[PDB]
Structure 1
């Protein structure tokens, strides 16, 4: 019908800048930190709630 509205929402969206953050980790040390975060000093916590990226 009409090609006039195209790129509408991507152009209408307020361009928020990417905030800076530190370097992540790579390789053996990244696998090390995600092994620690899951199998040693995992928090003894609420039952069955281990649903990480749990936003409430």
Structure 2
């Protein structure tokens, strides 16, 4: 083996870590579809 596989995982290690943001939960089921209908039609 040529030994060229030395830099596996490079960019995913260099990438600065940014934490997720706390956002309020999404509706699910009929309410999500209702909210989706209300913002695409009159």
Name the TM-score, length of structure 1 as normaliser: 0.65
Q: Which has the larger radius of gyration?
A: 2
Secondary structure in structure 1 of the residue aligned to 2:5: coil
1:7 CA displacement: 0.6
User: Deviation of residue 15 (structure 1)?
Assistant: 0.4
- State the Cα RMSD in Å: 0.9
More helix by share: 2
Gaps of 5+ in 2: none
Structure 1 runs not aligned, ≥5 long = 39-56
Higher relative CO (CA 8 A, sep ≥ 6), structure 1 or 2?
A: 2
Q: Give the distance between the partners of 1:32 and 1:14, measured in 2 at CA.
A: 38
